[PDB]
Structures are given as structure tokens and as C-alpha cells.
Amino acid sequence: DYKFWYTQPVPKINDEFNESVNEPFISDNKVEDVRKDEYKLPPGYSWYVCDVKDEKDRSEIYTLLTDNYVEDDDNIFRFNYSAEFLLWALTSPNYLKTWHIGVKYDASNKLIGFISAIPTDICIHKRTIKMAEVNFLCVHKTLRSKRLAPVLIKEITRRINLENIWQAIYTAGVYLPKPVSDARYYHRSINVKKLIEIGFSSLNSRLTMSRAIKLYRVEDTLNIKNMRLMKKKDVEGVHKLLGSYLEQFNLYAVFTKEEIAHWFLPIENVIYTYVNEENGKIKDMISFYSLPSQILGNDKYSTLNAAYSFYNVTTTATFKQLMQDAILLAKRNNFDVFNALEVMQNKSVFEDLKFGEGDGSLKYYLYNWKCASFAPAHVGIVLL
Ligand SMILES: CCCCCCCCCCCCCC(=O)CSCCNC(=O)CCNC(=O)[C@H](O)C(C)(C)COP(=O)(O)OP(=O)(O)OC[C@H]1O[C@@H](n2cnc3c(N)ncnc32)[C@H](O)[C@@H]1OP(=O)(O)O
Ligand SMILES: COc1cccc(Cc2nnc(-c3sc4ccccc4c3OC3CCNCC3)o2)c1
Ligand SMILES: [Cl-]
Ligand SMILES: [Cl-]
Ligand SMILES: [Mg+2]
């Protein structure tokens, strides 16, 4: 019934809009009218302002997500974003501490809830809008189905509106009103014995262990011999290469040079970016972020080490040769699997590079924005 979602400026389950429609649900919003009072929490619960730059606050958020965040459809895996990933994800340029919102249970003084936003310029159907990207919504497992989530959502909405920002972007595995795009995820095995042992992957009588291993073997040589970790000097080159590539899509963030530096400069165990420089010019780029999963109840392994395709552009190779190199660089950095969504040009290489179709899909939503939906090939933004 979406008793909560139907009260919000998002499309109804049956709404479809033509390609020309591209506008807010509610316009002419006035900052001066935004409620100034915090949304009421149940008795015994309080808002808490997280300082993600403070290691101990950051560690509380970490512990909350580790224990209570998103699981795969069979509840075999749970996302285990690292503390250093959270810091990177949450302190991008012009970020507001005030958009990093915790809920504590007063008597234990423990964090039981969290939601966060960061500001981003989003171009939707060629209109660039100041938006907030919402992420890390989490309610403790002991407190599910008590309608806390709408309170967290209303409170971040109010705080976003205070900054005169009226649109948001978010992604979920769950179906809500109403996705502007739906993207399946696909997986390319690197450490197949491990994937076989934890049941990320399966064998049959055609496919013995040694045959599966051979299938997914890769040559330890790049197609683009000079692909190297990105360095500060490459920032303008990356801003030029990526900013222009992205113009082609129907939904993409507009990056400043300061954002390109934040989002791409390598950080071990968080973000990996490689570039191919041809006489001072950045001609190709590969990026992926590190997002391990906790393996629940497996005697041998605790962690699934996984690389997540971020942004990839080539002008000197084929997209297939570029993504092959992506897989090889993931393998070199001890990732067990390389994951991609069917956005941008990615689907075109999945068959040949031996990706398998996953279990489900990631839905893209906008808040307070009416437009035509589109196939995932036209989505040019990957969230964290
Ligand atoms: C202008 C700026 C605007 C700013 C805001 C933009 C919008 C941002 C929206 C947020 C974007 C986040 C993106 C992001 O973080 C990435 S998607 C990951 C969300 N987190 C998880 O899945 C972690 C594990 N699950 C949980 O922690 C709980 O199940 C959560 C807290 C998800 C729901 O708590 P609960 O204890 O299970 O449920 P109740 O409290 O009783 O509440 C039920 C209501 O919550 C609706 N619900 C459930 N999951 C949702 C989800 N993933 N988005 C939006 N709504 C969701 C549900 O449909 C229902 O409403 P309805 O009755 O209408 O159907
Ligand atoms: C293997 O462990 C898990 C744990 C929880 C949920 C899943 C299912 C799933 N839920 N979202 C995604 C994916 S696959 C992928 C590939 C490339 C880039 C992004 C993603 C992605 O979602 C990202 C971004 C949105 N927030 C979650 C991670 O995958 C698998
Ligand atoms: Cl209300
Ligand atoms: Cl392990
Ligand atoms: Mg609840």
C-alpha cells in the first residue's frame, strides 16, 4: 500500500511520463517555510549528530552497519563497508556534518539508527539540479517494522530542505515508488574455488572444480600496457575525459575538479583508479571501489573481498579490452570477484568477459522529480 511513500512527492505506482516531462512534483518551495523542529522519535530515543571525521563516532556507525546493514537475498552475505570507506563516502566536497544523522537509545547510549546525505549536482534528462544523494539508511535489526525509517527519512528531508535543496537521488534493492531505472548486477569470478566454497558460485558434472578454475583464468598482462594508479597531477585529465563521456547519458552527476579529486584519487581498500596517459593526456581510465561482504556462518571464510565497477572510459582500446583490464587490476589487488551493473556500456561486455547474471537488481529513484523512465544503459551514475 506504500502508506508512507504515497504521502511523499514521488510517482504513484501507475504513473508513467513522456520524455518531454522533466520537472519537480512540487515547485516554488520556500526555505523560510521549512519546519525548524526535529521530527519526534519514540520515547527513550534521541537524534545524535555523528562526526564522521572522529574515529570513535565513525566506529559506532561502522559497527551499526556491520551488524544491521543490507543482506543478499538469501541472507548468506551482509555488506561490510569499512570505516575508511565511510569516511570517504561521507566527506566529499561541501558535505554537511548535519546530514549525517544518528539515533541513539538513550539508556545504553548506543547508536541504533543512521541515515546520511551528501550534496551532488545531478543531470537528469539534460537539466542539472542541486540534489542530495541519500545512503546508509539503517535501523537496528531488533527495531525493524516499527516505522522508524519514515522518521529518519522525514528528518533528513527537513535538513536538506533547510539548505534550499528540494530533490534527492537514491538506490535500493527493494522496489519503491517508483524507479526511474532498474539495473541488474552481474559478477565476474576471480577466485572461483573460494566463490564455490562459500556458495557464491556452483559446479556441475560438465563443470568440475579444475574446469571452473581454468574457465576464469586470466592472463596477467594488461591490454593497455601503461595503465597506472592515478596521481594528483591526473585530476584535470580525468575531469576532462570523464565529464565529457558522461554527457551522453540520461542521469549522471556533474563533477567539479574538486569532486574528481575526492572520488577518484586512490585510497587503499577503498577506491582504485588507473589511468592511461599519452603524452601528458589522460586517454583512458578504470575505477572500482572495495566493498567487502561479511560471510554469515561459513566455517572457513569470514569475508568476501569484492571490487565494484565505478567509472570506466576508453578512447585507445575497445570497451571490452578496457573492462578486461579492469578485471585484471582487481585480481592484482586480491579481490575475489568483480561486480558490475548493467549501466552505461557495461552489458555489452558481460557475455564475452564471462560475467554471470546475479540475483536481483538495483532500482534508481529520484525524490520530488517527475520524468520518463529509461533503460539502464542510459544511467550514467554509480552510487556507493
Ligand atoms: C529533498 C531531499 C529528500 C531526502 C530523502 C530522499 C528519500 C530517501 C529514502 C531513503 C533512501 C535510502 C537509500 C539507501 O540507504 C541504500 S538502500 C539500503 C537501505 N538499508 C537497508 O536495507 C539495511 C537493512 N534494512 C534496514 O536497516 C531497515 O529495513 C530499513 C531502515 C531499510 C527500513 O526500516 P524497517 O524497520 O524495515 O521499516 P519501517 O521503519 O517500519 O518503515 C517502513 C517504511 O520504510 C520504507 N522503506 C523500507 N526500506 C526502504 C528503503 N531502502 N528506502 C526507502 N524506504 C524504505 C518501506 O517501504 C515502508 O514505507 P511504506 O509504508 O510506504 O511502504
Ligand atoms: C555479496 O553481498 C551482497 C550483500 C548485500 C546485497 C547484495 C546484493 C546487491 N545489492 N546492491 C548490489 C550492487 S552490485 C553492484 C555492482 C556495481 C556497482 C554497484 C553495485 C551494487 O550496489 C552498490 C551501490 C548501491 N549501494 C550498494 C552497493 O548488490 C550482495
Ligand atoms: Cl509528519
Ligand atoms: Cl576470509
Ligand atoms: Mg522500524
Side-chain angles (χ1 to χ4, degrees), residues 318-346:
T318 71
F319 197 63
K320 186 208 223 187
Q321 298 144 352
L322 187 77
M323 294 304 297
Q324 173 165 244
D325 284 355
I327 292 163
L328 167 67
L329 299 158
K331 177 180 174 90
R332 284 185 181 172
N333 288 280
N334 310 302
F335 289 99
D336 289 324
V337 63
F338 179 99
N339 301 309
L341 298 161
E342 60 168 335
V343 305
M344 291 178 283
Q345 309 162 76
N346 293 349

Side-chain angles (χ1 to χ4, degrees), residues 115-131:
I115 191 176
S116 77
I118 54 155
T120 181
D121 283 76
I122 306 294
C123 189
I124 174 57
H125 191 83
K126 314 198 164 204
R127 267 185 93 166
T128 306
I129 307 299
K130 299 283 188 182
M131 294 201 211

Side-chain angles (χ1 to χ4, degrees), residues 191-300:
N191 184 355
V192 100
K193 196 155 89 38
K194 184 169 169 181
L195 297 182
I196 294 299
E197 296 184 355
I198 74 182
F200 192 105
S201 295
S202 30
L203 293 168
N204 71 51
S205 275
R206 331 146 176 247
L207 203 69
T208 61
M209 193 54 88
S210 66
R211 290 202 67 148
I213 291 171
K214 194 168 48 180
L215 177 55
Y216 290 112
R217 175 144 59 218
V218 301
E219 162 64 27
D220 189 29
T221 300
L222 301 145
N223 296 138
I224 301 156
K225 50 166 169 168
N226 307 332
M227 218 20 106
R228 68 177 168 65
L229 272 164
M230 179 187 180
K231 274 181 281 157
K232 259 194 189 229
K233 52 168 184 169
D234 305 317
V235 173
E236 199 197 341
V238 170
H239 180 230
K240 263 179 135 96
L241 181 77
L242 180 70
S244 193
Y245 172 81
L246 290 167
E247 51 174 316
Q248 80 180 278
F249 301 113
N250 201 52
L251 182 73
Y252 64 97
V254 189
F255 292 95
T256 71
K257 278 162 85 207
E258 293 68 32
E259 297 172 307
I260 292 285
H262 181 89
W263 290 115
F264 296 88
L265 278 169
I267 306 169
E268 179 91 293
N269 304 137
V270 175
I271 179 67
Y272 297 68
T273 302
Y274 295 80
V275 293
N276 178 51
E277 173 180 25
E278 264 207 6
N279 50 44
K281 283 304 121 119
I282 295 324
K283 304 223 159 187
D284 310 97
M285 69 180 291
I286 283 165
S287 56
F288 46 88
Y289 60 77
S290 170
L291 175 37
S293 289
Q294 180 178 355
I295 308 169
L296 317 170
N298 173 281
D299 289 342
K300 180 177 179 192

Side-chain angles (χ1 to χ4, degrees), residues 151-167:
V151 188
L152 275 166
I153 299 159
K154 304 181 279 196
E155 177 60 11
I156 207 157
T157 297
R158 188 189 69 74
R159 298 192 191 184
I160 283 161
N161 297 163
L162 289 170
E163 292 316 299
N164 202 27
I165 291 178
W166 307 95
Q167 278 79 32

Side-chain angles (χ1 to χ4, degrees), residues 21-77:
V21 169
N22 201 41
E23 66 174 38
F25 273 109
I26 294 164
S27 293
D28 303 299
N29 301 289
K30 311 276 174 260
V31 163
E32 149 128 29
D33 285 345
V34 178
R35 298 184 73 97
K36 303 186 207 159
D37 52 323
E38 291 178 324
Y39 274 91
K40 185 205 187 282
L41 283 162
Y45 301 86
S46 293
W47 300 108
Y48 178 70
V49 149
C50 308
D51 183 355
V52 68
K53 287 188 178 182
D54 179 86
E55 172 285 317
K56 177 151 189 185
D57 270 6
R58 185 164 65 258
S59 85
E60 286 191 305
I61 292 159
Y62 171 76
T63 296
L64 174 76
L65 297 173
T66 302
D67 296 338
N68 304 279
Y69 203 48
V70 179
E71 294 181 0
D72 76 296
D73 256 87
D74 302 340
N75 319 103
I76 316 146
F77 300 111

